[PDB]
JSON list of C-alpha atoms in Angstrom, two decimals:
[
{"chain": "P", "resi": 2, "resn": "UNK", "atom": "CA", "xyz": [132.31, 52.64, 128.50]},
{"chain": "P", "resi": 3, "resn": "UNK", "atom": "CA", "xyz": [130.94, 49.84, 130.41]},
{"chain": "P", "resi": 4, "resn": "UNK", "atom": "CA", "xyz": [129.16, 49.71, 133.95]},
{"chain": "P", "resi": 5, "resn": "UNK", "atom": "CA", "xyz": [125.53, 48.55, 134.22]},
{"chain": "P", "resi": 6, "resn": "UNK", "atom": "CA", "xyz": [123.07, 48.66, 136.78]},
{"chain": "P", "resi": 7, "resn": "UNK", "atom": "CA", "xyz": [120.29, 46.82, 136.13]},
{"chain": "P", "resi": 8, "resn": "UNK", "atom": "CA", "xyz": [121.05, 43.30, 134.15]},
{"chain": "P", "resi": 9, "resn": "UNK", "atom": "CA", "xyz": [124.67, 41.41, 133.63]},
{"chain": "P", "resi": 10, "resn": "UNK", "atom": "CA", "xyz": [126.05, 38.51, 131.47]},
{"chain": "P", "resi": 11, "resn": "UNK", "atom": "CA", "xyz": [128.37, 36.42, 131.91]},
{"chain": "P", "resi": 12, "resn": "UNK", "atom": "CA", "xyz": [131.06, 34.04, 130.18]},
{"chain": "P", "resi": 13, "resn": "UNK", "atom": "CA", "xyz": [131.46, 30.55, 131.10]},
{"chain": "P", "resi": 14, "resn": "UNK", "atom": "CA", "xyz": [134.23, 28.92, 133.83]},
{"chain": "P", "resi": 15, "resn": "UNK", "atom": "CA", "xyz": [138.05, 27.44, 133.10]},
{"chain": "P", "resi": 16, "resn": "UNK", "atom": "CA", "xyz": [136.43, 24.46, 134.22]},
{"chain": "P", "resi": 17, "resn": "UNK", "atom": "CA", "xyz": [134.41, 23.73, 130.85]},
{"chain": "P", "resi": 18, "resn": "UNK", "atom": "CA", "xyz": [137.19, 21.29, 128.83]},
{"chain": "P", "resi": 19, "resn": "UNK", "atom": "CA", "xyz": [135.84, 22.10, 126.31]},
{"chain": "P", "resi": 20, "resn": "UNK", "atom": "CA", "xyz": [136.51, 26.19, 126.75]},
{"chain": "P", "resi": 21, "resn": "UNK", "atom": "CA", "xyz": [139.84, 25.12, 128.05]},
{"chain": "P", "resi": 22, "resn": "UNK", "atom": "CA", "xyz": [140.93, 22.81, 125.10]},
{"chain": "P", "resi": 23, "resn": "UNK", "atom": "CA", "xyz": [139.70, 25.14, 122.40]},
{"chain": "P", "resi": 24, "resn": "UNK", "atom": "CA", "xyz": [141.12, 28.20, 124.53]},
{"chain": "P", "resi": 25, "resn": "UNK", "atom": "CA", "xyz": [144.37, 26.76, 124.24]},
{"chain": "P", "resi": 26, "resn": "UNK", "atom": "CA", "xyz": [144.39, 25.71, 120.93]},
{"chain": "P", "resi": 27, "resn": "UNK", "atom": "CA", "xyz": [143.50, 29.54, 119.93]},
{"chain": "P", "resi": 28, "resn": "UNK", "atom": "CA", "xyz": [146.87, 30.50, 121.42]},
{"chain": "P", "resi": 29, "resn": "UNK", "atom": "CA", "xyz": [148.92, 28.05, 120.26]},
{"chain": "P", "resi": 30, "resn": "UNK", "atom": "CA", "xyz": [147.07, 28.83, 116.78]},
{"chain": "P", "resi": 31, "resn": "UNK", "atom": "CA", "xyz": [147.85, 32.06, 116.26]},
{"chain": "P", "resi": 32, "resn": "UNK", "atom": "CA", "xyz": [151.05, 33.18, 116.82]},
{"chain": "P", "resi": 33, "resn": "UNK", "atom": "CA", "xyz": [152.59, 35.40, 113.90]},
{"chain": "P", "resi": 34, "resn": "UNK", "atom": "CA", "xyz": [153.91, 37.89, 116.25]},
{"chain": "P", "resi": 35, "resn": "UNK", "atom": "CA", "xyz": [154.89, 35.67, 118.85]},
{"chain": "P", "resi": 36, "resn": "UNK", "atom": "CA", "xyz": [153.01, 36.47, 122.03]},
{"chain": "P", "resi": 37, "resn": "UNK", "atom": "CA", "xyz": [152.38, 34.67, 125.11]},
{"chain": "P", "resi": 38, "resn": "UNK", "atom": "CA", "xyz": [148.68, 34.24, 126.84]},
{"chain": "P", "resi": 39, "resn": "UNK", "atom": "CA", "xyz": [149.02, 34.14, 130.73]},
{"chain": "P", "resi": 40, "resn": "UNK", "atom": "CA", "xyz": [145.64, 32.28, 130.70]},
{"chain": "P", "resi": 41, "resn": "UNK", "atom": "CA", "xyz": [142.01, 32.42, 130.23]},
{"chain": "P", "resi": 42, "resn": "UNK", "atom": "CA", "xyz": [139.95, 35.13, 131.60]},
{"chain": "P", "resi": 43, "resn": "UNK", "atom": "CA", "xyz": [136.45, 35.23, 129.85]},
{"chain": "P", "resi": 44, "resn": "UNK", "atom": "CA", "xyz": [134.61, 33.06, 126.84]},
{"chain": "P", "resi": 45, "resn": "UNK", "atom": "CA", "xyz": [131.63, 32.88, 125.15]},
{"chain": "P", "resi": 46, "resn": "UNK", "atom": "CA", "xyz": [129.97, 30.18, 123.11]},
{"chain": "P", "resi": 47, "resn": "UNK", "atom": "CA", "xyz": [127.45, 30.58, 120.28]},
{"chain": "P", "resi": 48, "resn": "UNK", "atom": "CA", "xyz": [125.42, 27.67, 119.33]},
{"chain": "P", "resi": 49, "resn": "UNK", "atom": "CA", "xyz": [121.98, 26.68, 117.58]},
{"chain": "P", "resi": 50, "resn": "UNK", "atom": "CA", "xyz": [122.00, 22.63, 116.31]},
{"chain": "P", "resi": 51, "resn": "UNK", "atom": "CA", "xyz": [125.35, 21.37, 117.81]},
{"chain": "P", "resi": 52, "resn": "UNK", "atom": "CA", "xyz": [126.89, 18.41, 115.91]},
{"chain": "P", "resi": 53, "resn": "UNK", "atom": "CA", "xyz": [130.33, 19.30, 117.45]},
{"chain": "P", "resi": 54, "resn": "UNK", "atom": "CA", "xyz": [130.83, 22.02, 115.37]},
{"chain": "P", "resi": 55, "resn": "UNK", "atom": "CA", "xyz": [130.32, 24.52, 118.13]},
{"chain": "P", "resi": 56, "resn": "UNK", "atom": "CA", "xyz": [131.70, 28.42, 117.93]},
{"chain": "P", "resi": 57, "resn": "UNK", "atom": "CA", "xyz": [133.42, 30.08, 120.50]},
{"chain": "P", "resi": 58, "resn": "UNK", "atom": "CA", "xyz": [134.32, 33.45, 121.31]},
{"chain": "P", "resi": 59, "resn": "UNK", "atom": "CA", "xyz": [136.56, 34.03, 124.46]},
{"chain": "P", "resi": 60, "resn": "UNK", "atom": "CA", "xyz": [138.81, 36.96, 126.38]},
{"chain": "P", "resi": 61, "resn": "UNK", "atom": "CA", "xyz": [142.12, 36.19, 127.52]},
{"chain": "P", "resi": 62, "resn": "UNK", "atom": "CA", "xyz": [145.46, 37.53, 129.42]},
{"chain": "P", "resi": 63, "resn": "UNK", "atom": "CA", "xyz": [148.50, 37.69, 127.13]},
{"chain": "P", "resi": 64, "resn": "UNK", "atom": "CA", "xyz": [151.87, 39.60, 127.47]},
{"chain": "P", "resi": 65, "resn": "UNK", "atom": "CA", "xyz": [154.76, 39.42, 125.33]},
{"chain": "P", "resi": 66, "resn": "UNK", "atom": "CA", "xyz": [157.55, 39.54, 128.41]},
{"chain": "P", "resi": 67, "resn": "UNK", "atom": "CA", "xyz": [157.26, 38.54, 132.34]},
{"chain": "P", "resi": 68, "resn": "UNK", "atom": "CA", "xyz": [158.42, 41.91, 133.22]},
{"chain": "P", "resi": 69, "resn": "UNK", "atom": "CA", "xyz": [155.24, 43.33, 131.43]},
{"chain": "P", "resi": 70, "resn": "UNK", "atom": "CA", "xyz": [151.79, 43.53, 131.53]},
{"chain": "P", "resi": 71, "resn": "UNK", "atom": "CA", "xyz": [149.12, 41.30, 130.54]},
{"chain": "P", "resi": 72, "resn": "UNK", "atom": "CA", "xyz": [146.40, 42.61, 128.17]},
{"chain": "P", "resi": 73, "resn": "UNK", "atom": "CA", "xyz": [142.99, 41.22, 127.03]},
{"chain": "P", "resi": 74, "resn": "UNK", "atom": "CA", "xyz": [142.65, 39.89, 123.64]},
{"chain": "P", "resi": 75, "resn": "UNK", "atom": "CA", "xyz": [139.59, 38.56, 121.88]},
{"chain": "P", "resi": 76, "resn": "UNK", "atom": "CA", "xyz": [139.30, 35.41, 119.91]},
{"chain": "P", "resi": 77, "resn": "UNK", "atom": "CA", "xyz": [137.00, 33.48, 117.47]},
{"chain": "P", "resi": 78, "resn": "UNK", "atom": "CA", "xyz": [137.56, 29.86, 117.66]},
{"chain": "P", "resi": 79, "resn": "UNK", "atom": "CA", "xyz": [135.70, 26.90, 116.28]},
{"chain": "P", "resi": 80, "resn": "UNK", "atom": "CA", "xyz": [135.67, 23.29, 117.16]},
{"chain": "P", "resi": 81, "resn": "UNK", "atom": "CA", "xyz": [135.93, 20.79, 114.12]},
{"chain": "P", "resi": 82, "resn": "UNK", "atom": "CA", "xyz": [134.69, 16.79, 115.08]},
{"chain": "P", "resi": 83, "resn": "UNK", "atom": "CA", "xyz": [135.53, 15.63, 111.70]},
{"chain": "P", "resi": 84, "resn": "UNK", "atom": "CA", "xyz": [139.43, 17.06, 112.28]},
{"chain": "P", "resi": 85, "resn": "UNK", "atom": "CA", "xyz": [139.10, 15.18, 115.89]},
{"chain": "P", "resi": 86, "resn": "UNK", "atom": "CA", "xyz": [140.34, 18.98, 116.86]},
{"chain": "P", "resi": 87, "resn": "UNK", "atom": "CA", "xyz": [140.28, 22.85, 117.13]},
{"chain": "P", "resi": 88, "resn": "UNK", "atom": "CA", "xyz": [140.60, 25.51, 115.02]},
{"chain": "P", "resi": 89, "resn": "UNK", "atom": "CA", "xyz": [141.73, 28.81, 115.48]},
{"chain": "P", "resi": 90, "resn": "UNK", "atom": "CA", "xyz": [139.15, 31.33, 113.42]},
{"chain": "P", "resi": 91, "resn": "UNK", "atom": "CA", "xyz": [140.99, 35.08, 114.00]},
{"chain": "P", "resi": 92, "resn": "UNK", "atom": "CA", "xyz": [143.24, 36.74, 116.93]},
{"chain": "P", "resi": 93, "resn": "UNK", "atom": "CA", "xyz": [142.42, 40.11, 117.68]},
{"chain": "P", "resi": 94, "resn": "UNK", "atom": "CA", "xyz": [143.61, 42.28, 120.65]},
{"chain": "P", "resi": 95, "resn": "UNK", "atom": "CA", "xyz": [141.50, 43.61, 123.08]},
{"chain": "P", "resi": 96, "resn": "UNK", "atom": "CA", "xyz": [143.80, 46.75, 124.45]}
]
């Protein structure tokens, strides 16, 4: 049950490409159910020595129909230099 009232964190913006690439490339990861993400809502990013290895943990909008709702799922991504890519770490749902 969330609702603070004295300190709040937040995510970072769409704008970040690199939040936006490796957003993306979470989706079109993971897909054994077949489901379709409406677009980014929230991430995260946890880092200590970056050598473009970065992880990333992000909140998203996803519905399987357009005549349904859109829920929030959470995913663990991590971004690979060596692959020249993304990579897709687990899909979980967040409803």
């Amino acid at each position: 049950g969330p609702g603070p009232a004295i300190g709040e964190v937040i995510g970072i913006s769409v704008n970040d490409p690199r939040v936006k690439e490796i957003a993306e490339f979470a989706l079109k990861q993971h897909a054994e159910q077949n489901l379709i993400l409406a677009g980014v809502d929230a991430g995260q990013i946890i880092k200590g020595i970056p050598h473009w290895d970065n992880y990333y943990n992000l909140i998203l909008s996803a519905k399987h129909s357009p005549h349904e709702f859109s829920k929030f799922y959470n995913v663990v991504v991590l971004e690979k230099a060596s692959d020249n890519s993304l990579k897709l770490v687990a899909f979980v749902p967040l409803f």
